[PDB]
Amino acid sequence: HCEEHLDPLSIYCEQDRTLVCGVCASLGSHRGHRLLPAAEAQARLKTQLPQQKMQLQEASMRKEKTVAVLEHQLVEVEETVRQFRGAVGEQLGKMRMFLAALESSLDREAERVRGDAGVALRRELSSLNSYLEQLRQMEKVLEEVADKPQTEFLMKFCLVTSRLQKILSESPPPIQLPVISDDFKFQVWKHMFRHLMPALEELTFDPSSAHPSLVVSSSGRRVECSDQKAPPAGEDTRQFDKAVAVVAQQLLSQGEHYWEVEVGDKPRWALGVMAADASRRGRLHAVPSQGLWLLGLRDGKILEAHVEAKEPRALRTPERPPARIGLYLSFADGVLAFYDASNPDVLTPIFSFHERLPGPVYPIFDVCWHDKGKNAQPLLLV
Amino acid sequence: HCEEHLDPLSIYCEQDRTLVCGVCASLGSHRGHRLLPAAEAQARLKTQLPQQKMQLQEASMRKEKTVAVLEHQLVEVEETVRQFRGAVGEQLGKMRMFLAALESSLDREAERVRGDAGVALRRELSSLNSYLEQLRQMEKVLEEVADKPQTEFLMKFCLVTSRLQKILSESPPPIQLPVISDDFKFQVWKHMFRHLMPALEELTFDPSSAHPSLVVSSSGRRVECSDQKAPPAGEDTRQFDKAVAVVAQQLLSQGEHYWEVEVGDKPRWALGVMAADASRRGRLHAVPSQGLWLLGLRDGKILEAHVEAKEPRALRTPERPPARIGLYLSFADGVLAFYDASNPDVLTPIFSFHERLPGPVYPIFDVCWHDKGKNAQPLLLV
Ligand SMILES: [Zn+2]
Ligand SMILES: [Zn+2]
């Protein structure tokens, strides 16, 4: 084991990790190193077995945990991708099925209209064929009895004249046709925008946080005003004392929601959202610092937005005041957008919000003064 | 034939158009019925046989005309309904296929991102599996060979420790893709609106209708402005001699067309259309009496629409001046609509018209004065 001394190696050296023999351990690479009796070295390196064992166990457990974490990340990426697939598929199939259903319904309606028109015009065709047959019969009777004996002619003259006069009073005078248009692109685009809104969140009013000026009925969907006094309020933060406003029964914190409100003949009103952690009683201002976001319309032509400032902002309204407004709320983007829902098939934008939200929020509605007699117009909520 | 006068009928009675006898017309049923004899009256009132024949022929011809009208109405309504069915179905299947294409493109993008993340995480997983195999091998070798004879045990202890120290050189570092949103549908809607416009009619310019003050080149596809003296013009009705304007070679009168134009750095310019059945030469204004609709930009930030009035309507201008505008022309609805084409994938409406449908129209484009030195800004055309 030595190649130099014609004798093998028999002594190990730990601090140089090298095997040697007596001659090499006498002159050269080793004389007094961490040589071994095997006894001192065995005891000294075996006493520290649990240290290395514990380090190995630490490394093994840590790397197993790392493997599990990475596998969990892989699974979570798979879940995210699959959820993305499903959500995109549903949100595009909504429009796909809407367009397909509309096309199929219109095609079936056109087929039914074609059948009805064919039936009517075939009835008219049968009537006209009968009329032509009667005319030919009368002509042949005339040409056959015009040269009969005098007695038969004098017997039949009046009769034939009366028959002609009677049969000359059964005849239909015949523009009554179905219509088509070229604005299909714009109408389909706008109606698709309309039908892409989420479901109408069925909101009902909440009287526990309302002012006793307005009155609510119709299964919590209708609210109007009266002309009678309300007893005074007490001491409670959740009761509205300054503004004549109300919030809804529902409390939304995640997802997507949308609802249309028809105001009808009421000239002055306002809508918006209010944070649940905000003040309901006491002096209140149109400040989002109090968690209130508002948008109001008065006089039928004066629209105003109360953004966070000491000044409202007006907008142009058409000569005919629209009476139905749709609100869309998204908690993900935190966007509350307004659209003109007075047209049942087309919406026109009005206003929108883009902020961060405390969460959650109540949809708040505020009526203007009762006008003392004439503001009995109802307020609906779909 | 009388039961009272023992005589048959021999006298005609005009007020009753009936043959009677004399006695009843003397003391009875025809006291004053203005009697007639029967032979002369029979022949004289019989003279109108060809009259009845001609009336019967007239009625037959009128009802035959009615039959022809009904048949033509049936066939033409059927053809109109079938053509509308086919056109609407195909032009909505167009949107269906567009939605499918967008969904497939997004699916391919998601698949590519998932594949890249999976490749990275699988490389890391394979590395960690190899590391775990090494750890298990080391642990099992130690716990199985820890009880060998002392010579081999002390020979292998150091080796194993050094192997652990060598393999203790692997520090573990311990993917990014978008998720669904609520404006995802709206963005898809906007891209659908952008890409749903009809095909870009590949129209080229006609140099026979340009003023030689500014320069036109590239086979009638490029036109820009210089600051140079202009040679005098010639004689042509379709060629602008007073104003530095140009029209297109093609002349279209039915259907739907759309095109985007980039204006770049030029601050003042104007575009529009001119009716072909109107006056063509001389200085012309945006008057539908001459079938002219215009739209201009000045000061680089002041956009204006030239509707039919004695004033260029000063539309509201955005904070960012757009440098690419798309124009859509529909002859059916007679609509000239403007859109913001600065976004290469989404267009936003600006204005529209609903007016006279003269037919056909020349697309007219007018550049302002060369300003003699500073109006060297180019004019692009996409
Ligand atoms: Zn030796
Ligand atoms: Zn008689």
With H, G, I as helix, E, B as strand and everything else as coil, classify residue A293: strand
Residue numbers in A near B153 (CB within 8 A): 42
Distance from CA of B296 to the nearest CA of A (A): 24
A245 and A144 in a common domain: no
| Residue A288 buriedness (CB in 10 A; 0-12 / 13-18 / 19+) | buried
B182–A74 CB contact, under 8 Å: no
Q: Contact at 8 Å (CB) between A22 and B97?
A: no
Q: Does A303 reside within a domain?
A: yes
Token representation of residue A40: 């001192």
Distance from CA of A132 to the nearest CA of B (A): 6
Distance, CA of B74 to CA of B66 (rounded, Å): 12
Distance, CA of B138 to CA of B131 (rounded, Å): 11
Token representation of residue A112: 């039914």
C-alpha B28 – ligand 2 centre gap (Å): 8
State how beta strands B269-275 and B256-262 pair. Answer: unpaired
C-alpha B43 – ligand 2 centre gap (Å): 24
Q: Does B178 reside within a domain?
A: no
Distance, CA of A268 to CA of A270 (rounded, Å): 7
Distance, CA of B363 to CA of B274 (rounded, Å): 6
> Known binder of ligand: residue B285?
no
DSSP string, A171-214: -----------STHHHHHHHHHHHHTS--B----EEGGG--TTE
> Could you tell me the sign of the dihedral formed by the alpha carbons of A298, A335, A326, A226, in that order?
negative
State how beta strands A302-306 and A292-298 pair. Answer: antiparallel
Residue B313 has phi, psi (to 5 degrees) of -60, 120
DSSP string, A99-167: HHHHHHHHHHHHHHHHHHHHHHHHHHHHHHHHHHHHHHHHHHHHHHHTTS-HHHHHHHHHHHHHHHHHH
Distance, CA of B365 to CA of B246 (rounded, Å): 5
Distance, CA of A201 to CA of A46 (rounded, Å): 74
Residue A169 has phi, psi (to 5 degrees) of -140, 20
Domain range enclosing A289 = 199-229+238-380
Distance, CA of B292 to CA of B144 (rounded, Å): 98
**Whether the bond into B360 is cis, omega within 30 of 0:** yes
B179–A256 CB contact, under 8 Å: no
Q: Contact at 8 Å (CB) between B154 and A12?
A: yes
Identity of the residue numbered B48: Q
Ligand positioned closest to the Cα atom of A21: 1
Identity of the residue numbered A106: L
Distance, CA of A63 to CA of B81 (rounded, Å): 72
Residue numbers in B near A128 (CB within 8 A): 63, 66-67, 70
Distance, CA of A117 to CA of B81 (rounded, Å): 12
Q: Does A1 reside within a domain?
A: no
Q: Residue B232 has what DSSP assignment? A: P
CA distance to A22, A210, A229, A369, per residue, from A215 (Å):
111, 10, 12, 14
A263 and A293 in a common domain: yes
| Residue A113 buriedness (CB in 10 A; 0-12 / 13-18 / 19+) | middle
- Per the structure, how many domains does chain A have? 3
Interface probe with B: pick from A105, A114, A163, A257, most Cβ of B within 10 Å: A114
Residue numbers in A near B124 (CB within 8 A): 70
Q: Contact at 8 Å (CB) between B329 and B291?
A: no
Q: Contact at 8 Å (CB) between A323 and A262?
A: yes
The beta-carbon contacts of A142-149 under 8 Å, at least 24 apart in sequence, are A142/B49, A142/B52, A142/B53, A142/B56, A143/B53, A146/B46, A146/B49
Token representation of residue B269: 């310019």
Q: Does B76 reside within a domain?
A: yes
B53–A143 CB contact, under 8 Å: yes
From B141, B167, B193, give the residue that closes a domain: B167
B339 and B217 in a common domain: yes
Residue B8 has phi, psi (to 5 degrees) of -80, -175
| Residue B222 buriedness (CB in 10 A; 0-12 / 13-18 / 19+) | middle
Distance, CA of A194 to CA of B226 (rounded, Å): 50
Count of helix runs (H) and strand runs (E) in chain B: 4, 15
Task: List residues bridging with B349 in a β-sheet.
Answer: B339
Token representation of residue A275: 């944070």
A114–B81 CB contact, under 8 Å: yes
Distance, CA of A261 to CA of A156 (rounded, Å): 77
Distance, CA of A194 to CA of B189 (rounded, Å): 12
DSSP string, A19-54: EE-TTTTTSSS-SSSSB--SHHHHHHHHTTHHHHHH
Residue corresponding to tokens 């037919």: B359
A84–B179 CB contact, under 8 Å: yes
C-alpha A2 – ligand 1 centre gap (Å): 5
Q: Residue B285 has what DSSP assignment? A: -
Cβ neighbours of residue A164 closer than 8 Å, sequence gap 6 or more? A138, B52, B55
Angle, CA B47 vertex, CA B41 and CA B49 arms, to 5°: 130
What CATH number does the domain containing B316 carry? Answer: 2.60.120.920
CA distance to B4, B91, B305, per residue, from B257 (Å):
94, 15, 20
CB pairs under 8 A between A and B: 200
Distance from CA of A208 to the nearest CA of B (A): 33
Q: What is the maximum span of chain B, computed from C-alpha positions, in angstroms?
A: 170
Query: Comparing C-alpha atoms, which of B358, B293, B299 is closest to residue B327?
Result: B293
Query: Comparing C-alpha atoms, which of B346, B192, B184 is closest to residue A256?
Result: B184
Q: Does B100 reside within a domain?
A: yes
Q: What is the maximum span of chain A, computed from C-alpha positions, in angstroms?
A: 173
Identity of the residue numbered B101: A
Distance, CA of A144 to CA of A203 (rounded, Å): 84
Q: Contact at 8 Å (CB) between A26 and A5?
A: no
> Could you tell me the sign of the dihedral formed by the alpha carbons of A110, A115, A120, A124, in that order?
positive
B60–A136 CB contact, under 8 Å: yes
> Could you tell me the sign of the dihedral formed by the alpha carbons of A105, A111, A115, A117, in that order?
positive
Report CA A215 to chain centroid distance, whole Å: 30
Q: Contact at 8 Å (CB) between B118 and B124?
A: no
B338 and B207 in a common domain: yes
List b or e across B109-141, with b for residues whose CB sees 16 or more CB atoms inside 10 angstroms. Answer: ebeebbeebbeebeebeeebeebeeebeebeee
Q: Contact at 8 Å (CB) between A185 and B196?
A: yes
Report CA B193 to chain centroid distance, whole Å: 9
C-alpha B25 – ligand 2 centre gap (Å): 7
Q: Does A3 reside within a domain?
A: no
CA distance to A290, A306, A333, per residue, from A287 (Å):
6, 8, 21
Query: Comparing C-alpha atoms, which of B182, B195, B199, B187 is closest to residue B97?
Result: B195
CA distance to A264, A266, A280, A286, A305, per residue, from A223 (Å):
12, 12, 20, 23, 23
Instruction: For residue A177, give the chain B residue with the closest CA.
Output: B77
A39 and A24 in a common domain: yes
H-run or E-run covering A260 = strand A256-262
Report CA A6 to chain centroid distance, whole Å: 93
B158–A41 CB contact, under 8 Å: no
Ligand positioned closest to the Cα atom of A25: 1
- Method by which the model was determined: X-ray
List b or e across A225-239, with b for residues whose CB sees 16 or more CB atoms inside 10 angstroms. Answer: beeeeeeeeeeeeee
Report CA B256 to chain centroid distance, whole Å: 6
Residue A142 has phi, psi (to 5 degrees) of -60, -50
From B122, B149, B167, give the residue that closes a domain: B167
B289 and B206 in a common domain: yes
Distance, CA of B195 to CA of B98 (rounded, Å): 9
With H, G, I as helix, E, B as strand and everything else as coil, classify residue A294: strand
H-run or E-run covering A51 = helix A49-145
Q: Starting at the edge strand that comes first in sequence, how are the strands of the sheet with A335-340 ordered? A: A256-262, A324-330, A335-340
Residue numbers in A near B118 (CB within 8 A): 74, 77
B346 and B216 in a common domain: yes
Report CA A337 to chain centroid distance, whole Å: 12
> What's the first-to-final CA gap in chain B, in angstroms?
104
B264 and B124 in a common domain: no
Q: Residue A265 has what DSSP assignment? A: T
Ligand positioned closest to the Cα atom of B10: 2
Q: Contact at 8 Å (CB) between B337 and B325?
A: no
CA distance to A142, A162, A312, per residue, from A152 (Å):
12, 16, 99
> Could you tell me the sign of the dihedral formed by the alpha carbons of B40, B41, B42, B46, in that order?
positive
B180–A96 CB contact, under 8 Å: no
Q: Contact at 8 Å (CB) between B280 and B321?
A: no
Q: Does B216 reside within a domain?
A: yes
Token representation of residue B161: 């420790």
Distance, CA of B45 to CA of B34 (rounded, Å): 15
C-alpha A12 – ligand 1 centre gap (Å): 12
Distance, CA of B217 to CA of B223 (rounded, Å): 6
B96 and B208 in a common domain: no
Q: Contact at 8 Å (CB) between A379 and A222?
A: yes
Instruction: For residue A40, give the chain B residue with the closest CA.
Output: B154
Q: Contact at 8 Å (CB) between A341 and A324?
A: yes
Of A88, A124, A182, the CB nearest to B103: A88
CA distance to A115, B78, B304, per residue, from B81 (Å):
12, 5, 42
H-run or E-run covering A216 = strand A214-217
State how beta strands B269-275 and B292-298 pair. Answer: antiparallel
Distance, CA of A45 to CA of A197 (rounded, Å): 75
Residue numbers in A near B131 (CB within 8 A): 63
Residue corresponding to tokens 């209209």: A113
Q: Residue B99 has what DSSP assignment? A: H
Token representation of residue A298: 């008065």
C-alpha B26 – ligand 2 centre gap (Å): 9
Distance, CA of A52 to CA of A46 (rounded, Å): 10
C-alpha A32 – ligand 1 centre gap (Å): 15
Angle, CA B297 vertex, CA B294 and CA B301 arms, to 5°: 150
Identity of the residue numbered B334: G
Half-sphere exposure of B181 (CA within 13 A, CB side): 12
Please provide the size of chain A in residues.
Answer: 382
Q: Residue A239 has what DSSP assignment? A: S
Residue B328 has phi, psi (to 5 degrees) of -120, 130
| Angle separating helix axes A49-145 and A184-195, nearest 10 degrees | 140
Q: Does A314 reside within a domain?
A: yes
C-alpha B114 – ligand 1 centre gap (Å): 63
Residue corresponding to tokens 């056909």: B360
Q: Starting at the edge strand that comes first in sequence, how are the strands of the sheet with A214-217 ordered? A: A214-217, A222-225, A379-380
Query: Comparing C-alpha atoms, which of A274, A377, A381, A288 is closest to residue A326?
Result: A381
State how beta strands B245-248 and B205-210 pair. Answer: antiparallel
Q: List for chain A the helix, strand, coil content (%; round to 5).
A: 35, 20, 45
| Residue A95 buriedness (CB in 10 A; 0-12 / 13-18 / 19+) | buried
Please provide the size of chain B in residues.
Answer: 382
B135–A59 CB contact, under 8 Å: yes
B128–A52 CB contact, under 8 Å: no
Q: Contact at 8 Å (CB) between B39 and B62?
A: no
Distance, CA of A280 to CA of A290 (rounded, Å): 9
H-run or E-run covering A81 = helix A49-145
Query: Comparing C-alpha atoms, which of A130, A158, A142 is closest to residue B52?
Result: A142
Token representation of residue B44: 């004289």
Distance, CA of B218 to CA of B380 (rounded, Å): 12
**Whether the bond into B349 is cis, omega within 30 of 0:** no
Residue numbers in B near A117 (CB within 8 A): 74, 77
Outline where chain B has alpha helix (H).
39-46, 49-145, 150-167, 184-195
Q: What value does the CA radius of gyration of chain A take, rounded to a whole number of Å? A: 46
Token representation of residue B88: 């609407």
- How would you classify residue A143: left for phi > 0, otherwise alpha for psi between -120 and 50, otherwise beta? alpha
B56–A142 CB contact, under 8 Å: yes
B163 and B21 in a common domain: no
Distance, CA of A91 to CA of A97 (rounded, Å): 10
Distance from CA of A135 to the nearest CA of B (A): 6
With H, G, I as helix, E, B as strand and everything else as coil, classify residue B302: strand
B210 and B321 in a common domain: yes
Q: Residue B252 has what DSSP assignment? A: B
Q: What value does the CA radius of gyration of chain B take, rounded to a whole number of Å? A: 46
Query: Comparing C-alpha atoms, which of A268, A263, A275 is closest to residue A244?
Result: A268
Distance, CA of A322 to CA of B350 (rounded, Å): 22
Cβ neighbours of residue B196 closer than 8 Å, sequence gap 6 or more? A185, A189, B94, B95, B98
Cβ neighbours of residue A237 closer than 8 Å, sequence gap 6 or more? A279, A280, A281
> Known binder of ligand: residue B24?
yes
B147 and B35 in a common domain: no
Residue corresponding to tokens 């021999």: B10
Token representation of residue A345: 């098939």
Residue corresponding to tokens 């042509």: B236
Report CA A293 to chain centroid distance, whole Å: 21
Distance, CA of B369 to CA of B65 (rounded, Å): 65
Query: Comparing C-alpha atoms, which of B72, B70, B49, B62 is closest to residue A135?
Result: B62
A125–B179 CB contact, under 8 Å: no
H-run or E-run covering A89 = helix A49-145
